[PDB]
Amino acid sequence: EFIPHIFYSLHQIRKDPNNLSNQLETLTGSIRHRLKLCKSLISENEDTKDLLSKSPSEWQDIIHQREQELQIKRDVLDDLYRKLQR
Amino acid sequence: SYVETLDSMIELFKDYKPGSITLENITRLCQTLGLESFTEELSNELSRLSTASKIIVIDVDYNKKQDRIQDVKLVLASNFDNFDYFNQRDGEHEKSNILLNSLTKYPDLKAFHNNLKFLYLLDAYSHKLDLFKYFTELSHYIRQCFQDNCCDFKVRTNLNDKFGIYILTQGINGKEVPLAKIYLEENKSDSQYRFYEYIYSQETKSWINESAENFSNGISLVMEIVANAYTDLIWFPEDFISPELIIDKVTCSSNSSSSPPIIDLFSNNNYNSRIQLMNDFTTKLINIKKFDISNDNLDLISEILKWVQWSRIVLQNVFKLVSTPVLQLIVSEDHIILDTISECNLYDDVKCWSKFIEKFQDIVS
Amino acid sequence: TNSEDKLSKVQLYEDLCRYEDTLSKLVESVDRFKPNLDIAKDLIRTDEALFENVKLLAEDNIYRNLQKIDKDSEELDSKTRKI
């Protein structure tokens, strides 16, 4: 996890700038560490890069191929049921 | 200028990301204000965060199982225990605690930080002037001053989970509308500025300083105009109030041409074709948000509020009606004349102002 | 090769990109011990945009259900094929 740690370190930056330069440098290094691993985790995992939050219309095209291929199967199966009963 | 810029950046960061409501962030906020803080375990389910200063002690009860604040108590180490930290709502038997509400009703610590900064200001600047006592009593003195001066203003303490003395008017629907907020602020300009106790005497019908020995240094009593918000801004004649009493002048920074919409309405030929507008203002109109009303300036509260009310009822409505696409309309600082048909001035009653606007609307429609 | 093109197409990739850029600006500022407010505010609003896109990704499951119904489609097709 890097998201809550980034949040928290962000908040003790914005709460206490009066800390000596040592703490500021160390904490900024810590955030650089967390975002470095963030880029590493992104880079090494395929699923988290394919699904980068947003839905283009490809989901609606999946729904169109799904619905058109289902109903034609139902129609042909109805035709087979009607024909074979003789 | 480095320290002033750094303080301005720190104030900006505190306001931009107040932090989430957690026990740790509340403790860090109190420590950032220089408040002493300790945590006690009252039970397996309840922890108390106690924070203290010179006069104030704040106990915050935290439910460890629910991840929620359960209670907040303010205690004063002053001889004055009667400080009102509840919201004034008419008709609710449950006085809702401002500090508790600021930690339970809001998504962030911003409401709590502002209320804590106000309590810390009273704490730091109270001595023999007790600002907790004086600020509580001041709300009663202002209420009396309005009764004695026949001003149709209501005084409430603590509106919308915020510390302050709120001055309300009746709006068109009988709904109370805040006009102004009175509160104490640190005097950034003069640390040697003496703030005295002024009492409204029923006998003299005037503000009096009973104890010129009772003062605090580096604090001002501020009157802030509560805009309902550019047409909802209140504009004042430049010479209406001494420039030394103006804390916050909204400088229209020199890259957006927003004249007062009033002055653009003397320059732009897009009028109701039935009205010839005449400007008789002798002074420039300035937007003022905050006034110093400290010491001898407490008499100005009634004059400022009458102007704010007259500007809302008369001026802003006249401007709205003229701006919506031949009678002469003369508009001056303290009087408005519609040919020989109707007039009103700043010293007339609110009923005369309403009758003027009704007649003006009937002619312009 | 088309994989990276697809990855660059979704907004949250650009979001992480300029978030990294904003922190780079911030660290350069603190290195110069001259903290510029605009960099920090840009960082926080970019982080917020990241987090809203983090929610927007979650409502994921629709694609997964489409995937299972696709497998149902081809298995039914194979069944009818051997029939």
DSSP B324-363: ---EEEEE-SSEEEETTTEEEETTS-HHHHHHHHHHHHHH
How far apart are alpha carbons B284 and B92 in whole angstroms? 46
Q: Do B13 and C44 touch (CB under 8 A)?
A: no
Q: Do A25 and C30 touch (CB under 8 A)?
A: yes
Longest dimension (CA), chain B: 80
How far apart are alpha carbons B276 and B281 in whole angstroms? 16
Q: How far is A8 from chain B (nearest CA, A)?
A: 9
Q: Is B6 on the interface with A (CB under 8 A)?
A: yes
- Classify B67 in phi/psi space as left (phi over 0), alpha (psi -120 to 50) or beta: left
Distances (CA, A) of C44 to A6, A11, A40, B13, C56: 11, 11, 22, 11, 18
How far apart are alpha carbons B166 and A9 in whole angstroms? 39
Residues B330/B336/B338/B342 CA torsion (nearest 10 deg): -160
Distances (CA, A) of B216 to B76, B83, B191, B212, B230: 19, 19, 10, 11, 37
SS3 (DSSP) at B146? helix
CB atoms within 10 A of CB B240: 18
Which residues of chain A lie closer than 8 angstroms to B26, CB-CB?
none
Closest CA to B353 of B333, B335, B365: B335
Q: Judging by DSSP bridges, how do beta strands B46-52 and B36-41 pair with one another?
A: antiparallel
SS3 (DSSP) at B302? helix
Give me the residues of B, 314-343, that contact A with CB < 8 A.
none
Closest CA to B153 of B355, B345, B319, B307: B307
Give me the residues of C, 31-70, that contact A with CB < 8 A.
33, 35, 40, 43-44, 47, 51, 53-54, 56-57, 60, 62-63, 66, 69-70
| CA–CA–CA angle B128, B130, B133 (5° rounding) | 140
Closest CA to B266 of B258, B256, B274, B276: B276
How far apart are alpha carbons B201 and B14 in whole angstroms? 41
SS3 (DSSP) at B318? helix
Which residue on chain B is closest to C34 by alpha carbon? B6
How far apart are alpha carbons B148 and B170 in whole angstroms? 19
Q: What are phi and psi of A73, to 5 degrees?
A: -65, -45
Q: Judging by DSSP bridges, how do beta strands B327-331 and B335-338 pair with one another?
A: antiparallel
Which residues of chain C lie closer than 8 angstroms to A70, CB-CB?
73
Q: Do C44 and B12 touch (CB under 8 A)?
A: no
Strand order in the sheet with B68-76: B36-41, B46-52, B56-63, B68-76
How far apart are alpha carbons B35 and A15 in whole angstroms? 15
| B286 token code pair | 């300035």
| C25 token code pair | 């600006």
B10-18 LR contacts (CB < 8 Å, sep 24+): B10/A17, B12/C37, B13/A14, B13/A17, B13/C37, B13/C40, B14/A14, B14/A15, B14/B113, B15/B110, B16/A14, B16/C40, B16/C41, B16/C44, B17/A10, B17/A11, B17/A14, B17/C44, B18/B108, B18/B109, B18/B110, B18/B113
CB atoms within 10 A of CB C44: 16
Residues 6+ apart with CB under 8 A from A58: none
Which residue on chain A is closest to C27 by alpha carbon? A28
> Could you identify the residue written with the tokens 């009634």?
B302
Which of A43, A54, A60 best tests the C interface by mutation, with the highest count of C CBs <10 A? Answer: A54
> Could you identify the residue written with the tokens 């605009």?
C38
Q: Where are the alpha helices (DSSP H) in B159-293?
A: 261-267
SS3 (DSSP) at B186? strand
Q: What are phi and psi of B261, to 5 degrees?
A: -55, -25
Residues 6+ apart with CB under 8 A from B182: B138, B142, B164, B165, B166, B167, B221, B222, B223, B224, B293, B301
Which residues of chain B lie closer than 8 angstroms to C44, CB-CB?
16-17
- Report how many Cβ contacts below 8 Å link chain B to chain C: 9
| Residue B119, CA atoms < 13 Å, CB-side half-sphere | 29
Give me the residues of B, 15-34, that contact C with CB < 8 A.
16-17
Do B280 and B330 form a contact (C-beta atoms < 8 A)? yes
- By the 10 Å C-beta count (0-12 exposed, 13-18 middle, 19+ buried), B126 is classed as buried
> Could you identify the residue written with the tokens 């810390």?
B120
How far apart are alpha carbons B362 and B357 in whole angstroms? 9
How far apart are alpha carbons B349 and B330 in whole angstroms? 20
The DSSP element (H or E) to which C20 belongs, if any, is helix C11-31
Do B286 and B235 form a contact (C-beta atoms < 8 A)? yes
Which residue on chain A is closest to C16 by alpha carbon? A39
Which residues of chain B lie closer than 8 angstroms to A15, CB-CB?
14, 19, 28-29, 32
Do B183 and B118 form a contact (C-beta atoms < 8 A)? yes
Which residues of chain A lie closer than 8 angstroms to C73, CB-CB?
66, 69-70
Closest CA to B145 of B291, B300, B289, B292: B300
Which residues of chain A lie closer than 8 angstroms to C33, CB-CB?
21
How far apart are alpha carbons C47 and B238 in whole angstroms? 45
Closest CA to B12 of A7, C36, C49: C36
- Strand spans (E) along B242-309: 246-249, 275-279, 285-292
Distances (CA, A) of B299 to B267, B278, C29, C40: 36, 33, 50, 45
Do B60 and B52 form a contact (C-beta atoms < 8 A)? no
Q: Is B54 on the interface with C (CB under 8 A)?
A: no
**Residues in chain C after which the chain is broken, C→N over 2.5 Å:** 59
How far apart are alpha carbons B324 and B275 in whole angstroms? 11
Distances (CA, A) of B260 to A55, B232, B250, B277, C57: 47, 11, 11, 16, 47
Q: How was this structure determined?
A: cryo-EM
Closest CA to B74 of B58, B90, B88: B58
Q: Which residues pair with B183 in a beta bridge?
A: B222
Closest CA to B125 of B178, B183, B68: B183
Which residue on chain A is closest to B28 by alpha carbon? A15
Which residue on chain C is closest to A71 by alpha carbon? C73
Q: How far is C29 from chain B (nearest CA, A)?
A: 14
Residues 6+ apart with CB under 8 A from B221: B182, B183, B184, B195, B292, B293, B294, B298
How far apart are alpha carbons B157 and B307 in whole angstroms? 22
Number of residues assigned to chain B:
365
Q: Find the radius of gyration of the CA atoms of chain A.
A: 27
Give me the residues of B, 21-60, that contact A with CB < 8 A.
25, 28-29, 32
Which of B1, B10, B16, B108 best tests the C interface by mutation, with the highest count of C CBs <10 A? Answer: B16
Q: What are phi and psi of B330, to 5 degrees?
A: -95, 125
Q: Judging by DSSP bridges, how do beta strands B327-331 and B275-279 pair with one another?
A: parallel
SS3 (DSSP) at B243? helix
Q: Do A15 and B16 touch (CB under 8 A)?
A: no
Do B154 and B140 form a contact (C-beta atoms < 8 A)? no
| C56 token code pair | 């927007």
Q: Do B9 and C35 touch (CB under 8 A)?
A: yes
> Could you identify the residue written with the tokens 């209420």?
B143
Q: Which residues of A34-49 are buried (b: 16+ CB within 10 A; e: fewer)?
A: bbeebeeeeeeeeeeb
Which residue on chain B is closest to A8 by alpha carbon? B19
Closest CA to B314 of B285, B334, B284: B334
Do C31 and A28 form a contact (C-beta atoms < 8 A)? no
> Could you identify the residue written with the tokens 């931009």?
B16
The DSSP string of chain A is --HHHHHHHHHHHHH-TTS-HHHHHHHHHHHHHHHHHHHHHHHH-SHHHHT-S---THHHHHHHHHHHHHHHHHHHHHHHHHHHT-
Q: Do A10 and C44 touch (CB under 8 A)?
A: yes
Q: Which residues of B319-351 are buried (b: 16+ CB within 10 A; e: fewer)?
A: bebbeeeeeebebebeebbbeeebebbbeeeee
- For chain B, what is the total number of helices (H) and then of strands (E)? 9, 19
Do C71 and C26 form a contact (C-beta atoms < 8 A)? no
Q: What interhelical angle do B316-323 and B350-364 show, nearest 10?
A: 0
| B332 token code pair | 């001056």
Q: Judging by DSSP bridges, how do beta strands B219-225 and B176-186 pair with one another?
A: antiparallel
How far apart are alpha carbons C20 and C10 in whole angstroms? 17
How far apart are alpha carbons A9 and A3 in whole angstroms? 10
Closest CA to A64 of B126, C66, B104: C66
- Entry resolution in angstroms? 3.3
- Classify B78 in phi/psi space as left (phi over 0), alpha (psi -120 to 50) or beta: beta
